[PDB]
Amino acid sequence: RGFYELVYPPVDMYEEGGYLVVVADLAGFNKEKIKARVSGQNELIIEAEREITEPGVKYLTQRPKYVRKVIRLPYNVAKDAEISGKYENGVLTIRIPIAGTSVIKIE
Amino acid sequence: RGFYELVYPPVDMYEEGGYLVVVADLAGFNKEKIKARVSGQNELIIEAEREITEPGVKYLTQRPKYVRKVIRLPYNVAKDAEISGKYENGVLTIRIPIAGTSVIKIE
Amino acid sequence: RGFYELVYPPVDMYEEGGYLVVVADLAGFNKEKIKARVSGQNELIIEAEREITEPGVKYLTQRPKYVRKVIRLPYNVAKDAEISGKYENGVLTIRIPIAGTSVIKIE
Amino acid sequence: RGFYELVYPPVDMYEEGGYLVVVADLAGFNKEKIKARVSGQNELIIEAEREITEPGVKYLTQRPKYVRKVIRLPYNVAKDAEISGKYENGVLTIRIPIAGTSVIKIE
Amino acid sequence: RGFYELVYPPVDMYEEGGYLVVVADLAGFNKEKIKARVSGQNELIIEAEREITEPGVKYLTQRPKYVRKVIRLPYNVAKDAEISGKYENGVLTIRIPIAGTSVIKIE
Amino acid sequence: RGFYELVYPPVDMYEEGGYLVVVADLAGFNKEKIKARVSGQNELIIEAEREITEPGVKYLTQRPKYVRKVIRLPYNVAKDAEISGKYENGVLTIRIPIAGTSVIKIE
Amino acid sequence: RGFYELVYPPVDMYEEGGYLVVVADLAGFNKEKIKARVSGQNELIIEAEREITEPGVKYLTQRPKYVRKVIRLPYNVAKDAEISGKYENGVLTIRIPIAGTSVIKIE
Amino acid sequence: RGFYELVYPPVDMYEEGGYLVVVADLAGFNKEKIKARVSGQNELIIEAEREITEPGVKYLTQRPKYVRKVIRLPYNVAKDAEISGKYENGVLTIRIPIAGTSVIKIE
Amino acid sequence: RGFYELVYPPVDMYEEGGYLVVVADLAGFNKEKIKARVSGQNELIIEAEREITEPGVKYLTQRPKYVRKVIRLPYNVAKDAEISGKYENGVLTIRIPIAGTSVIKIE
Amino acid sequence: RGFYELVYPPVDMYEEGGYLVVVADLAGFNKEKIKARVSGQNELIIEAEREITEPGVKYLTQRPKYVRKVIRLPYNVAKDAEISGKYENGVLTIRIPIAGTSVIKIE
Amino acid sequence: RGFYELVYPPVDMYEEGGYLVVVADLAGFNKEKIKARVSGQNELIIEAEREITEPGVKYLTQRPKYVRKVIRLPYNVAKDAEISGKYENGVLTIRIPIAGTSVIKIE
Amino acid sequence: RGFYELVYPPVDMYEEGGYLVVVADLAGFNKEKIKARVSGQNELIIEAEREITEPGVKYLTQRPKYVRKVIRLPYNVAKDAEISGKYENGVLTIRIPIAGTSVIKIE
Amino acid sequence: RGFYELVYPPVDMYEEGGYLVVVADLAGFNKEKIKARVSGQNELIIEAEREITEPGVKYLTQRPKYVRKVIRLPYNVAKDAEISGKYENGVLTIRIPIAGTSVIKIE
Amino acid sequence: RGFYELVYPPVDMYEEGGYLVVVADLAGFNKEKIKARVSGQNELIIEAEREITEPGVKYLTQRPKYVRKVIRLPYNVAKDAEISGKYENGVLTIRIPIAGTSVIKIE
Amino acid sequence: RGFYELVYPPVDMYEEGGYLVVVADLAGFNKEKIKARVSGQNELIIEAEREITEPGVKYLTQRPKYVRKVIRLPYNVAKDAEISGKYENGVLTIRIPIAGTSVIKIE
Amino acid sequence: RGFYELVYPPVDMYEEGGYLVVVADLAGFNKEKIKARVSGQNELIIEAEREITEPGVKYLTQRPKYVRKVIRLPYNVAKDAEISGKYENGVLTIRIPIAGTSVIKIE
Amino acid sequence: RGFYELVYPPVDMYEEGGYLVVVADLAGFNKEKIKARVSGQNELIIEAEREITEPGVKYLTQRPKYVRKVIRLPYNVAKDAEISGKYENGVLTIRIPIAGTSVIKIE
Amino acid sequence: RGFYELVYPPVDMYEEGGYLVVVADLAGFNKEKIKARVSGQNELIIEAEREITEPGVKYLTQRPKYVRKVIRLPYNVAKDAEISGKYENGVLTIRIPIAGTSVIKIE
Amino acid sequence: RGFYELVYPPVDMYEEGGYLVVVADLAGFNKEKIKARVSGQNELIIEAEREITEPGVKYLTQRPKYVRKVIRLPYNVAKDAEISGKYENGVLTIRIPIAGTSVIKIE
């Protein structure tokens, strides 16, 4: 519950041949109580929450219940398809359709 | 791979009726390639590593492959039993025997 | 009329099962001379004004006649329905339709 | 519940022909759960409280349940009459008897 | 030609019963060599230029030939009508249609 | 009415073959309600005023009604002739006789 | 590979009678391995990459393999036509359709 | 024409088995209007120039016409052979003879 | 005997339905050698003293023999009744009559 | 509950002829809900907790429910005997065996 | 054309038995394109200009085309005679009549 | 004789088709009492001196009798020919042979 | 003999499958006049010394005769075996037994 | 009794062929009222005290009665033998057994 | 030999019924190789020296061989008698005659 | 691989009766993969490289693979003879001919 | 006993026709337990002491028992006569003989 | 031996009709143990050394045994003749041939 | 003549078995035009002067003609004997009688 209500989550993204994709850890949290979403086509949406109220002595439980950090998207995508999301062992990865009419005249 | 080779993992500990215990996230990493350890009875030992080399475009993969942070123990325990460790969905929790002859004369 | 032409109003918002909602005080001001509006779907609009010109001695009337403070919205909503607004005893609350196709693939 | 447990209420006072008077907003709060008081004749007394515990998502409910700010009186009044107080739509106004033997010899 | 290539023009705007309007000086410059425009519905567009090359001694001609300063709009308007612009004696004023479905539920 | 009761007008001057001259903008203001003057032969005199009291909503009318800025003259002129002044479209220009016995012995 | 992974490329743009245009160097890089794109109609998109791994001694190869710098557009254009791009000898120039209904009422 | 009359060109050098070599970009500029040179055997000489005078609106043409930056040589070479220079697509590369009697007694 | 001749005692107060009350620790000190008092009706009074002269080696006896800290009262009380005081196990609590004619006209 | 969750407890220690001893206040807390302990032979261990949740008006209850502060021991002792502890009226004193083979060769 | 548009010219003045005089360098500039003048009787006036537009490579031409620096006069002189000026080899000297009724009663 | 024993002379150089050249003012000083020189082929040499001892009142004769400032040469020249120097009206210009085997392989 | 009596030696360590190991330079010094040691199982021990008294002119002999720098060990080892040390060509490497009962319960 | 209750004693130590040893002044104090000790094998223990209460006028008696300063040991020794200590004329020196199995494999 | 060639010796002085006296430590140094003296009647004189050249390993021998610090005298004495000096166990005390005609007219 | 890519190597130089000489450590690196050189007669040249890529756990391998630091020479030497170099056990020493016509007229 | 062991006494001196004199307060202190003196002829001597050990509660007894401050004399006097001293009601004044051969040749 | 190993020698040079010359003190040092030299034609060479090891008490012997300070030459000279050097009574002066072909074309 | 009119001369002093002595350089100055002296018995006296008026070009003659720096004496001497002074080759040394009744009672 430390300053960690801001610091998390982990940043990770790249590209899958027409799939921008994303990655970030999510341990000890069902693939149900999690929430996905859509926003302006060029922004991030992350919410969800569990509850591990400090039990015994409670020393330095610098571990929250839910955090959030927006991060506008590079060149957007094509808001209409399906937000292909997933999760397993923590790997809370996704998928991006990625518009084809991107790389116009190069020559 | 950002300054995240220091910042992670998540801090979380308390007590289980004679079991100090611990908690910290571990997503996308087998309960095998993980390593536990013993050290002076009042310190921390954490290592292990996977490998998700940045695939496609690689934007800001501020997500390492392995990190570590030592944290001496309160009043130690009783180094002799078994380092009751575990893991599932990220929850890389443990168990502490906790010595019985702790709270001496109070009155 | 103090630096209060910036400081007010009070911040308060949450969620009503598909209704983002809002709250904020509005004392001594009719539910007529108030103004609502629409803007970019992800921003705030607040105007209106009364007039309590300092009467007698006028000591430190640090209380304005009208203020305003924009605050872009989380993930917008679905600009088309009706800006369900209200007011009574000061409670200048509202309602938000909130799009249903929000939380896409979680698993 | 933000730093607003100090910032509010609104400052407003003047004079009503022998009635110093006062003004300050009070929205969403009965004219019952409100409290008035007397103190040394040249100070302020304000207390009371409701309870709008953050409902749903709870974003930035920077709106307390009860605040207070003392402000000594100019030249006091004549502690004996009745603290003519009132309230409606937020306007939590009052009345001051104001002593008659104030402006002594001027010429 | 001083730091004046940034400082000018003069800020002035208000409202005309459903017409946001604007004002700003424009001396020594035809109502032809001036340029108007449209942009994101919530931003400003100002360009145009003349040429009074310093003649004789040229002392401190801190007066440019053309300047520009963007200023996003309050709540936009309704980009479709005509950018009712004008000019005379310098008064480079305009007109704004202003959408009617602005002030929704007040009560 | 912003800090613009100081910043304006625009600086512009040079020379017209024995006519130092001057230039500065003047939009939305008659060539009547304008005032000229004489002063010590090496200083500036500028006054006049109109009145565009903020109409509707009044946002940021950072445009005064009258400003002034003195600026001593280079080598003065020959206070006796006529302060050849003018105005049209804003261009509030003038004319300077300029003394002939200026450039004395050069060789 | 110096701080040059940010510093480059060269800024250059102007206008071609209804064609905003752009310019910027691109030496030692095919007109194939380059990438163009579309984004929010008022932003920049630049990616592409080669590979000149430091050969011999490798002294101060402060020259990257690929860089990027976004720069929102003035007043956008009309996203629908073709991103008329090109390249030769480094000159990585383009073309902009530029909407005609730009300069509305001037008089 | 920005502070770019200093910042450019790009730094790049290494070794070609007895050929120190060099690299740096040169787009939009003939392999004729370019100039090479010799100097003290341990310094740099770079000059040349084209001319793309800002055409239309001219926004931020932070792109010069000619720049220069000296950089003494490591251990010089053997000033006598030929300054094997070249150019194509921007790659303005060169060649260095490199003296053979360099690495004297090592053992 | 450290900077603790100022730092102590512990702050604690609230209300007992017409009894403002107080709380603050008092260990190793008799309920006799303690002193209570009255002062202006809106201030604090605390004195008393024992004596534990550093015995043996005397390391960091950062523990005084007597301290004091004044804290004016909110709205005073009704100086006339009895300063209902007490003490046991350290708990040096008290009682306040609290005037009844406090909360005047609320409506 | 002020910064007092650190500041307390009071420091006091000396020696009792082969008994280092300790002293520190403990008011309003049973000699049962207190906790003692052993740690590395040269450190401190202090925990326990009650609960006096602010009752009525709650002004400045700058008094915690539980605090802790470690302070390594001088030359340790001889961890094996019994942590002779006690408590009464707040006086939470202890006892130390103190090894006899301390003061070796002096002459 | 460096900061030299201020720094120059050279300061030099003294006295010639009733002739204050002046001195200052003037190379590469005709005794025709130079300008002299009169001003308030206690100030300086210096203007003129040639033109040596940087020819070839233009390295650091820190040499202007025209500069000016005012320097009020000691006790003035007697504005009426002739500004006895001259020039040769750069030496742009002058002459001052100097009033005779200067040194009044000394004894 | 002010800080001018450093500040002067005036910087000016360029190129004359195979003649780097130089320029710098020299007033009130013969084309004899001046000194030229040679130095390392890439440095400057300037000395000489007259004498204008402050005559009369001597006010602020911030004008030296002789100064000097070194400025290494770009790429040197070909030390062997004649330091083609000159002077007239102040203009203390020169000439440089400039080596022909300068611009080696460009293509 | 410069600040180098602290700066050296070179840091280098890793792991050899159950052998933590170490590395650090040691030139111009016999594999005899060197000293190894044991210390608390989690610290470093380095001493030894030669002697190269500055011979001739002695310029900047910023080279000591002996240095030392402690660096506690990660998790210690198992102090009992033999401090398997060595040396050749400078390479002053070692070997560590490394306890086997290190990585306890992982799953 | 000046800041001298920290500053003293004097530091002095070296080695006696397998006897680390120590040195430090001790004037005006018996070889009886002095104390020696054992601690963790790698730390220092120093206590003892006389008493020279300032007699007459007492000027700047910056001379304490007892001081202490810990200084962990290099590589410890072999806690078991006898703390060979002494004292005479002030010289409060000692003796260290020093373990023989220190300098392991050097070659 | 650290900064201890200044810091030492210990300050200590008072009065012995007509004997100002002095005190200071002197360990490990004969009552022969010490030096006393006389100076201006109101200043200090301290010199002497032994020699304990660092023997073995020499760690931090922050202990000099000789130091000195002057300290003028209060009201001097009566330079004529004998500088009654002594020493034993370190105590290097002295004696002062002290003039009798000191305390003149008090009443 | 720490900041050690600069810090190293060790400085050491003197003189050998007509041989300036040099010294600097070189452990773990063949007398083959090292490189020597000549440069301007008054500078340094040092390059070469091995490769000890961090093996196991890789803790703080603050040891590079190759470093370099230039240091102009005192009075040079006489570039023509042979750069008498060597190496053994790390000792990467050299030899300097040293010109004989150095110490000219002394008397 | 506050910082008053320095601040006091009061400065006061002047002249009595050949008697420099002095003045300063001395309350609550006999004209016996006071001390006078002689020193270098140009310095001050002040000592004496009583004893008012804080009695009851002892609040802020910022009043010492004895203080002293030296202040060299202007031009001394003639050390030989009698230190004419006195005291009464606090006034601890004195007398100075003052040498007659002071004011030598004036004309 | 103070910071004097940098500060000395004394700077002194001028010109002897085609003999630049030099001057600097040299006391207590033979005209034999002194050294002269040649270097790049435009730099300084100064070495030599005696030895006056502090004899008796050694107070502040801020007088070295040998110092050096380089100072490149104005325009060099003509390296070939003889370094005409000398010395007597300290005066360690010299002589410079000075090239004749220095002052080229002046007119 | 630089800041050298303070910096010089060289500090050097010690002792000659009852002869404090002194040393300092004195080049280029007769053993006649030098001045010695006596002062308060505990201060320094140094004056004398030659004259080497900068001859030729005069570059940086940072060498004065005479300097002086006082330095009170340790414990004075015995002002009565003869100021045994000398000089030769610069060495301007002296001699001190040194009082015998210096080192009084040591034991």
mmCIF file of N, CA and C in Angstrom, chain G residues 4 7-16 20 24-29 50 55-63 69 75 87 89-91, chain H residues 4 7-16 20 24-29 55-63 69 74-75 87 89-91:
data_model
loop_
_atom_site.group_PDB
_atom_site.id
_atom_site.type_symbol
_atom_site.label_atom_id
_atom_site.label_comp_id
_atom_site.label_asym_id
_atom_site.label_seq_id
_atom_site.Cartn_x
_atom_site.Cartn_y
_atom_site.Cartn_z
ATOM 1 N N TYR G 4 22.419 10.824 -30.259
ATOM 2 C CA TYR G 4 21.868 11.005 -31.597
ATOM 3 C C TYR G 4 20.624 10.181 -31.881
ATOM 4 N N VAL G 7 18.311 13.362 -31.200
ATOM 5 C CA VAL G 7 18.657 14.588 -31.908
ATOM 6 C C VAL G 7 18.222 14.661 -33.386
ATOM 7 N N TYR G 8 18.531 13.629 -34.160
ATOM 8 C CA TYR G 8 18.140 13.614 -35.562
ATOM 9 C C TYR G 8 16.631 13.332 -35.568
ATOM 10 N N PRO G 9 15.916 13.642 -36.672
ATOM 11 C CA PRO G 9 16.321 14.213 -37.964
ATOM 12 C C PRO G 9 16.288 15.755 -38.082
ATOM 13 N N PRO G 10 16.532 16.280 -39.303
ATOM 14 C CA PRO G 10 16.529 17.724 -39.554
ATOM 15 C C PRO G 10 15.135 18.253 -39.840
ATOM 16 N N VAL G 11 14.812 19.378 -39.217
ATOM 17 C CA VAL G 11 13.513 20.010 -39.379
ATOM 18 C C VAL G 11 13.491 20.927 -40.601
ATOM 19 N N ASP G 12 12.436 20.812 -41.408
ATOM 20 C CA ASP G 12 12.275 21.618 -42.620
ATOM 21 C C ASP G 12 10.870 21.418 -43.219
ATOM 22 N N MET G 13 10.122 22.508 -43.319
ATOM 23 C CA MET G 13 8.791 22.469 -43.907
ATOM 24 C C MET G 13 8.426 23.876 -44.348
ATOM 25 N N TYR G 14 7.446 23.977 -45.241
ATOM 26 C CA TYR G 14 7.001 25.267 -45.769
ATOM 27 C C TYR G 14 5.633 25.123 -46.443
ATOM 28 N N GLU G 15 5.504 25.562 -47.698
ATOM 29 C CA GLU G 15 4.234 25.442 -48.424
ATOM 30 C C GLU G 15 4.366 25.523 -49.945
ATOM 31 N N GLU G 16 3.595 24.682 -50.643
ATOM 32 C CA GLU G 16 3.596 24.613 -52.111
ATOM 33 C C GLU G 16 2.236 24.891 -52.761
ATOM 34 N N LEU G 20 1.353 21.759 -48.111
ATOM 35 C CA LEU G 20 2.219 22.100 -46.976
ATOM 36 C C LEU G 20 3.650 21.565 -47.127
ATOM 37 N N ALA G 24 13.650 16.740 -45.047
ATOM 38 C CA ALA G 24 14.509 16.194 -44.009
ATOM 39 C C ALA G 24 15.464 15.189 -44.633
ATOM 40 N N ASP G 25 16.700 15.198 -44.163
ATOM 41 C CA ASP G 25 17.697 14.291 -44.688
ATOM 42 C C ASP G 25 17.482 12.809 -44.348
ATOM 43 N N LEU G 26 17.981 11.968 -45.250
ATOM 44 C CA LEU G 26 17.925 10.509 -45.155
ATOM 45 C C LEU G 26 19.019 9.904 -46.053
ATOM 46 N N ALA G 27 20.255 9.911 -45.568
ATOM 47 C CA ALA G 27 21.355 9.361 -46.347
ATOM 48 C C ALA G 27 21.578 7.898 -45.959
ATOM 49 N N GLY G 28 22.226 7.151 -46.856
ATOM 50 C CA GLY G 28 22.517 5.741 -46.622
ATOM 51 C C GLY G 28 21.341 4.887 -46.179
ATOM 52 N N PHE G 29 20.177 5.129 -46.774
ATOM 53 C CA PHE G 29 18.992 4.367 -46.425
ATOM 54 C C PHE G 29 17.971 4.288 -47.558
ATOM 55 N N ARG G 50 18.093 0.567 -40.683
ATOM 56 C CA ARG G 50 19.171 -0.109 -41.428
ATOM 57 C C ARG G 50 20.060 -0.772 -40.347
ATOM 58 N N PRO G 55 32.336 -1.312 -37.317
ATOM 59 C CA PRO G 55 33.303 -2.275 -37.849
ATOM 60 C C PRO G 55 34.623 -2.439 -37.080
ATOM 61 N N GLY G 56 35.671 -1.813 -37.598
ATOM 62 C CA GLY G 56 36.981 -1.910 -36.986
ATOM 63 C C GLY G 56 37.096 -1.401 -35.563
ATOM 64 N N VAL G 57 37.969 -0.408 -35.369
ATOM 65 C CA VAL G 57 38.246 0.212 -34.056
ATOM 66 C C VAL G 57 37.023 0.810 -33.349
ATOM 67 N N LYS G 58 36.080 1.314 -34.134
ATOM 68 C CA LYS G 58 34.892 1.911 -33.564
ATOM 69 C C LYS G 58 35.364 2.981 -32.591
ATOM 70 N N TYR G 59 35.465 4.218 -33.072
ATOM 71 C CA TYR G 59 35.889 5.353 -32.246
ATOM 72 C C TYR G 59 34.682 6.044 -31.578
ATOM 73 N N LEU G 60 34.084 7.036 -32.240
ATOM 74 C CA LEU G 60 32.893 7.689 -31.683
ATOM 75 C C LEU G 60 31.770 7.653 -32.723
ATOM 76 N N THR G 61 31.257 6.462 -33.010
ATOM 77 C CA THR G 61 30.178 6.329 -33.979
ATOM 78 C C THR G 61 28.926 6.911 -33.347
ATOM 79 N N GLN G 62 28.837 8.234 -33.303
ATOM 80 C CA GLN G 62 27.667 8.890 -32.729
ATOM 81 C C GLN G 62 26.564 8.952 -33.785
ATOM 82 N N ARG G 63 26.452 7.902 -34.606
ATOM 83 C CA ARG G 63 25.432 7.808 -35.670
ATOM 84 C C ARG G 63 24.522 6.581 -35.555
ATOM 85 N N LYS G 69 10.836 11.544 -34.115
ATOM 86 C CA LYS G 69 10.393 12.793 -33.469
ATOM 87 C C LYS G 69 9.037 13.307 -34.010
ATOM 88 N N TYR G 75 -2.804 22.985 -38.925
ATOM 89 C CA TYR G 75 -4.264 22.923 -38.966
ATOM 90 C C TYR G 75 -4.745 21.638 -39.647
ATOM 91 N N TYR G 87 11.615 10.269 -52.193
ATOM 92 C CA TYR G 87 12.957 10.164 -51.647
ATOM 93 C C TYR G 87 13.990 9.997 -52.743
ATOM 94 N N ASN G 89 18.577 10.757 -52.975
ATOM 95 C CA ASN G 89 19.819 11.419 -52.555
ATOM 96 C C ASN G 89 19.745 11.840 -51.087
ATOM 97 N N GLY G 90 18.676 11.423 -50.418
ATOM 98 C CA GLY G 90 18.483 11.773 -49.023
ATOM 99 C C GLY G 90 17.204 12.576 -48.839
ATOM 100 N N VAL G 91 16.960 13.500 -49.767
ATOM 101 C CA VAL G 91 15.767 14.346 -49.735
ATOM 102 C C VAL G 91 14.513 13.488 -49.594
ATOM 103 N N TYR H 4 21.049 24.664 -36.139
ATOM 104 C CA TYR H 4 21.562 23.569 -36.980
ATOM 105 C C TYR H 4 22.786 23.912 -37.840
ATOM 106 N N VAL H 7 25.090 22.095 -35.072
ATOM 107 C CA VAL H 7 24.751 20.725 -34.676
ATOM 108 C C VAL H 7 25.144 19.614 -35.684
ATOM 109 N N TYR H 8 24.828 19.809 -36.963
ATOM 110 C CA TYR H 8 25.168 18.837 -37.999
ATOM 111 C C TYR H 8 26.660 18.998 -38.328
ATOM 112 N N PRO H 9 27.301 17.991 -38.950
ATOM 113 C CA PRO H 9 26.868 16.681 -39.449
ATOM 114 C C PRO H 9 26.909 15.534 -38.451
ATOM 115 N N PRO H 10 26.660 14.309 -38.948
ATOM 116 C CA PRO H 10 26.666 13.105 -38.122
ATOM 117 C C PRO H 10 28.057 12.496 -37.996
ATOM 118 N N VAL H 11 28.406 12.150 -36.760
ATOM 119 C CA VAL H 11 29.690 11.552 -36.417
ATOM 120 C C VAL H 11 29.672 10.024 -36.642
ATOM 121 N N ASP H 12 30.677 9.516 -37.362
ATOM 122 C CA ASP H 12 30.791 8.081 -37.652
ATOM 123 C C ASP H 12 32.178 7.741 -38.250
ATOM 124 N N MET H 13 32.929 6.890 -37.554
ATOM 125 C CA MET H 13 34.247 6.459 -38.010
ATOM 126 C C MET H 13 34.635 5.154 -37.331
ATOM 127 N N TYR H 14 35.557 4.424 -37.950
ATOM 128 C CA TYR H 14 36.011 3.142 -37.418
ATOM 129 C C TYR H 14 37.331 2.767 -38.083
ATOM 130 N N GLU H 15 37.413 1.552 -38.627
ATOM 131 C CA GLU H 15 38.633 1.090 -39.294
ATOM 132 C C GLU H 15 38.390 -0.028 -40.303
ATOM 133 N N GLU H 16 39.113 0.045 -41.420
ATOM 134 C CA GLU H 16 39.008 -0.933 -42.499
ATOM 135 C C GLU H 16 40.320 -1.654 -42.797
ATOM 136 N N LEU H 20 41.382 3.735 -41.645
ATOM 137 C CA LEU H 20 40.560 4.321 -40.574
ATOM 138 C C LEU H 20 39.139 4.638 -41.045
ATOM 139 N N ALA H 24 29.316 9.925 -42.558
ATOM 140 C CA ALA H 24 28.484 11.056 -42.150
ATOM 141 C C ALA H 24 27.510 11.286 -43.287
ATOM 142 N N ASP H 25 26.279 11.664 -42.941
ATOM 143 C CA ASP H 25 25.219 11.890 -43.935
ATOM 144 C C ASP H 25 25.379 13.164 -44.774
ATOM 145 N N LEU H 26 24.883 13.095 -46.009
ATOM 146 C CA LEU H 26 24.919 14.204 -46.957
ATOM 147 C C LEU H 26 23.777 14.005 -47.949
ATOM 148 N N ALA H 27 22.586 14.475 -47.585
ATOM 149 C CA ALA H 27 21.414 14.365 -48.457
ATOM 150 C C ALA H 27 21.158 15.672 -49.224
ATOM 151 N N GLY H 28 20.547 15.559 -50.406
ATOM 152 C CA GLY H 28 20.250 16.724 -51.232
ATOM 153 C C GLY H 28 21.439 17.607 -51.603
ATOM 154 N N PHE H 29 22.574 16.987 -51.931
ATOM 155 C CA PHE H 29 23.777 17.739 -52.279
ATOM 156 C C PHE H 29 24.759 16.988 -53.164
ATOM 157 N N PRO H 55 10.811 28.533 -49.346
ATOM 158 C CA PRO H 55 9.816 28.837 -50.373
ATOM 159 C C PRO H 55 8.552 29.523 -49.895
ATOM 160 N N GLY H 56 7.484 28.741 -49.758
ATOM 161 C CA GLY H 56 6.192 29.262 -49.325
ATOM 162 C C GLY H 56 6.077 29.904 -47.942
ATOM 163 N N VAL H 57 5.175 29.380 -47.102
ATOM 164 C CA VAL H 57 4.941 29.912 -45.753
ATOM 165 C C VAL H 57 6.166 29.933 -44.856
ATOM 166 N N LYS H 58 7.075 28.990 -45.077
ATOM 167 C CA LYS H 58 8.295 28.905 -44.290
ATOM 168 C C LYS H 58 7.910 28.832 -42.805
ATOM 169 N N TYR H 59 7.836 27.623 -42.254
ATOM 170 C CA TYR H 59 7.487 27.444 -40.842
ATOM 171 C C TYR H 59 8.747 27.383 -39.989
ATOM 172 N N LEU H 60 9.277 26.185 -39.751
ATOM 173 C CA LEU H 60 10.515 26.074 -38.984
ATOM 174 C C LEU H 60 11.588 25.341 -39.802
ATOM 175 N N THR H 61 12.130 26.025 -40.819
ATOM 176 C CA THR H 61 13.189 25.454 -41.664
ATOM 177 C C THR H 61 14.496 25.431 -40.853
ATOM 178 N N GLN H 62 14.569 24.544 -39.849
ATOM 179 C CA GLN H 62 15.762 24.419 -39.005
ATOM 180 C C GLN H 62 16.802 23.578 -39.740
ATOM 181 N N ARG H 63 16.914 23.804 -41.051
ATOM 182 C CA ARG H 63 17.869 23.108 -41.918
ATOM 183 C C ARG H 63 18.754 24.081 -42.725
ATOM 184 N N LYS H 69 32.467 21.157 -38.652
ATOM 185 C CA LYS H 69 32.955 20.743 -37.334
ATOM 186 C C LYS H 69 34.300 19.998 -37.444
ATOM 187 N N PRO H 74 43.240 10.781 -34.623
ATOM 188 C CA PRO H 74 43.865 9.969 -33.579
ATOM 189 C C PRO H 74 45.401 10.075 -33.573
ATOM 190 N N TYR H 75 46.031 9.357 -34.494
ATOM 191 C CA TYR H 75 47.480 9.328 -34.591
ATOM 192 C C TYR H 75 47.894 9.742 -35.987
ATOM 193 N N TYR H 87 31.008 9.315 -52.326
ATOM 194 C CA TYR H 87 29.635 9.771 -52.001
ATOM 195 C C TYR H 87 28.530 9.131 -52.903
ATOM 196 N N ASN H 89 23.920 8.586 -52.310
ATOM 197 C CA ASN H 89 22.725 8.451 -51.463
ATOM 198 C C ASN H 89 22.869 9.162 -50.107
ATOM 199 N N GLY H 90 23.950 9.911 -49.951
ATOM 200 C CA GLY H 90 24.179 10.610 -48.704
ATOM 201 C C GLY H 90 25.481 10.150 -48.079
ATOM 202 N N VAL H 91 25.714 8.841 -48.089
ATOM 203 C CA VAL H 91 26.928 8.246 -47.523
ATOM 204 C C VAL H 91 28.209 8.889 -48.037
#
